[PDB]
């Protein structure tokens, strides 16, 4: 029907469970600090002389550069909790359904 | 020898050797 | 379905599609924006819209503290 | 380091030839 | 002039000092900033405004 | 012109780290390398 | 919304391509890193807890290339950094929904920076400073990627996307590298906060999980109307780079898929230099997670051809009836029906197999295609072979590139980056003073000629 | 009608139109293509199409060769 | 060859900066896409014209 | 069963809190001010810590530094996952597992009723009763697992923890906790090798 | 450049055609050996890169 | 080694630094610290983290 | 209207600071801002706003 | 005794610590190497025979 | 009417937003870092957070 | 007294002026021949702005 | 005197010429 008045035909109802969603911080905490935006950019300077040494360009993204660097050193299969390193790894079978 | 005195002694002589001044790696 | 190579070469002849995406928010012609952070105030009404009348500085949510 | 002998197939834009004695 | 009128290094033009501490009493509001003038630059106080 | 002055200064071509560093540092960095390595801060060119 | 949109189970049920390992074509371009089985995420979410409210405590590192490995001599420095509270950005859902509409990381209470000092004897620590402060030797770091990246747009259903570069000096240029990004999932990085980023899922731009990488067809590298950059008749089709050659008569596909021959040769040569001396599976250490060979996946299937079977009858989904009487009609619900012989999956085996036509494609992801700027495509060093040749020539050429991408019904982005050198030369001459001088050779970004 | 200068400039003004037509088959947008040489079933639907499953290695209609 | 859309005039073009050491002039006309093969490839199955 | 004493199957080293070392009641050995905590070693700072935790668990920022420093020397040039050959199956990083859950807090929740196991009923009518026996019951709505998601999101408090098996806590007798040699530098000084010192 | 044309109703395409000085010099130094050196001067088909 | 590898004086190994000034915008957080690398000691920037 | 957000910039009007041209260094800078509605903003009718 | 004693199934059911990586604190300090899924032991047990 | 082109009466000047300069292909002219958003000249901050 | 909750809108409206972006380091007009109109980065070489 | 070191990649200012690893030793052994 179209009612929730506990009618007779309301006995026959089915309910699928809601779809799973899991939400937590990104790998290596990418996106939590503004890197590479010239507007809100960081400053590491020689406090006595405010000469910033972190001149950052608008294009070269250091988030993508760091992920590649992490893979080059060692391998990204052991989950390091402290830095929150956990590579997003789709299940190999689900992408390519080998139906046997 | 003052700088060479900061290295572990594997026996009698220090452990200096195999100059590994690196840092060239990039994408390539 | 036509007007730009509707029967021959197209997709993009026109251009040196060389505008690099300009990097500044707001380059999305009719994408209902989301919202002000946190708030889900739906409106972020679309940037091809009513932006001459500059940001409506709405009264901030401080019901408990301000009262 | 065998030999760099340079007397003066061939090409028209250079009157140069090289002998390599190994 | 082309030589010593102005610099070439990445020098910010306008700064946005934020209050280190603040208070909001019943009758007044007090804010405290620590404006820092780096070496080899000089600030004209006329160009300052809350 | 395989070497431009701006390239040699920024270590895109020219001497590697084992050479342009002062002899005091190279001897130092070789010594204290089981702990507190200094070999990932001075880059050295690899031209083709 | 994306819950309560029931999918007919018969769409992809137990008989789809009953023999082959075929990627379901409708979800070929769907982002695969958004899944309950994404083991990288489900571990990264259960780390915080299993409840709605989480008083977290994290240890975000520093990942800028000139600061990541600096060795600070004993001064006294400021260290300021703007963080980001945009829930759509810092968080990451699994459906890729819009988290700004639901709940946000309300508060950053007490961020404070930690530092660890090696306890070094004051005799050596003073000697080390005394020479590290000398201008003869000073730290020098190069960004690992070292590439000036730009995003060119691609509208809906567009196929040919051309780009251009005005006349410019290609002093030390190490090649190109490109991929495709769906524009509905990419932040406007230049803005402090963009309210038009309705997304939470994986962001391949700044994360590294590229999946749309397999939809390119052809590439041409024109240097101011000269022949293509490899144009010394150096390929099977020396005028441009075929990638995903379609139905073709001559023998130019490779590796049981539709990837062409030279492109496989170029890709294999670039990563591993294993092109000329025969093809072999490369060293386990030499291929990384983001390498070409580890992710390459050919696949193929055969389907009932329609133009030769003489009895083909295209039955739409709502009407096909396999396994009827023991499952739901078009929703995952109570089973309804009668039993009866099925009709949907046309048999491809036995004495009654129908004639069929094979279709073969490949599924490469998590990598970005590479075209090294080297004379023989090898990697014989950092400063490539032709980089030094430009310097000796000392002339400027404009670049013109065009692409042929598979059409998509949603706007996307062509993310192409030029390999460059991105070195810095940080030098600290006195106490509490840092002087960092940046150079980025082939695409400079400086207003000062020293 | 509308689009680029529905009322004004440019049948094409947007561009630099300098895409020099790049020469490769399939540059055309929605042309019902020809047949594989002497294989008329109107095979080439378009180069905006089911070419997502590219690689239709199709066995020809040679039945006597099959016997 | 530069494309020209349907029902469109005012076709602009350009050549990026380069040298004109022995340039001798231009020569141009106006073909039709229906009547021009893409002979940069081995065989174009989208050319239906005798 | 297995005897952890003589075959290396330790599993209880996750229940230590603080180790204090004193040489004949002098100043503590760990050093002058080598540790964030003033005069002891702190582990499992679980009850509450204003700013000292690591890896989203209840360890200590200095104990993690010491442990990684004794095994892989990864303490001063930043932390990173150690190399495979240097990380065995009895080493710290291989067996370190942090975890945390979200039990429903009772102090701040409006209406919380702690129901014991014999009275709580979930999935009733389709399962056994307190024993893996024949199913008995009627179906009815359930009541035990308090929800933590959705519109009804009863407030909760988070408790974290960590497990560390097959590993022995290590406190190297060195000035900087490194492994510069088998014969430590501190256990070579005249102060320790030419006199007798107590230990508490 | 900028060509203004009549608005034809079907997708035509312009056919600009510059003027260059492409020549060859075929050389046969000895038996069975032939080599050439092409040169298109304004729009050179080769440069430092290729 | 024993002679001149590590100090015998009093030194911390880990230092925390509270923000000198903080700015909490609706979607930002701008924290500014002051690193204080005292005399006769060197800090490797890879160890620092927020 | 009645309820109205404002974003104003107030100058400096003290003779020793109004134009000071202060050399490099680091100075603390605090000021107490009136919050009394009656004094801050004037009313045309001359009535009492508090 | 350790076999004739029954355990309530609901003590740890399918709904315990849902979505959490918890270690079931009641069974945390019990010996973990005593289990049918102890691949090392069940290999040695089956090595002798059955 | 009144043509603003040759007669200097311009009136639609207030409809502009961010304008960007990028000189060679990457270098942005407005300066090394010379504005509060040192990548383009912003003229109308449509919605301002600070 | 019976007002309604509201929201403000700002905007500016200027006519008759052409926006200007001087090609100087500090944007000041210290002369006709500007400051960057004679230095060799923008005099010796050749760039192509976008 | 034409050495072949000019064909070797340069790691710094010296060529990357290898050692005497020129071998083809293996068999099932």
Numbering used by the authors:
A (entry chain J): 302 to 401
B (entry chain 9): 4 to 31
C (entry chain P), H (entry chain Q): 1 to 67
D (entry chain V): 142 to 149, 158 to 171
E (entry chain E), L (entry chain J): 52 to 101
F (entry chain L): 4 to 51
G (entry chain J): 503 to 952
I (entry chain H): 653 to 702
From the article:
Human adenovirus D26 (HAdV-D26, or Ad26 for short) causes acute conjunctivitis and a prolonged enteric infection among humans. Significantly, Ad26 is being used as a vaccine vector against the diseases such as SARS-CoV-2 and AIDS. In addition to differences in the hypervariable regions (HVRs), Ad26 displays a short-shafted fiber comprising eight β-spiral repeats, compared with long-shafted fibers found in archetypal HAdV-C5. The overall structure and capsid protein organization of the HAdV-D26 capsid is very similar to that of HAdV-C5.
Here, we report the improved capsid structure for one of these vectors, human adenovirus D26 (HAdV-D26), at 3.4 Å resolution, by reprocessing the previous cryo-electron microscopy dataset and obtaining a refined model. Using this higher resolution map, we obtained a refined model for Ad26 capsid by performing real-space refinement using Phenix and model building in Coot, providing new insights into the structures and organization of minor proteins, IIIa, VI, and VIII, which were not previously considered. Not surprisingly, the significant structural differences between the hexons from Ad26 and Ad5 occur in the HVR loops. It is noteworthy that all HVRs, including HVR1, are ordered in the Ad26 hexon. Moreover, the FNT-peptide adopts “elbow” shaped conformation that appears to hook the helix at the base of the disordered RGD containing loop, which perhaps is critical for fiber latching onto PB. The Ad26 structure provided the first report of a well-ordered full-length protein-IX (IX) that revealed the connection (linker region) between the triskelion and coiled-coil forming regions in HAdVs. It appears that the APD domain in Ad26-IIIa is rotated by ~120°, compared with its counterpart in the Ad5-ts1 structure, which results in a longer distance (by ~25 Å) between the visible ends of MDLD and APD domains. It is noteworthy that this reorganization of the APD domain in the Ad26 structure results in the loss of interactions with the contacting hexon subunits. Notably, except for the ordered short segment of the processed peptide (140–149), the rest of the VIII structure is very similar in Ad26 and Ad5 virions. In the refined Ad26 structure, the directionality of the polypeptide chains of pVIn in the previous structure was reversed in agreement with the recent Ad5-wt and ts1 virion structures. Furthermore, we identified two, two, three, and two copies of pVIn bound in the hexons 1–4, respectively.
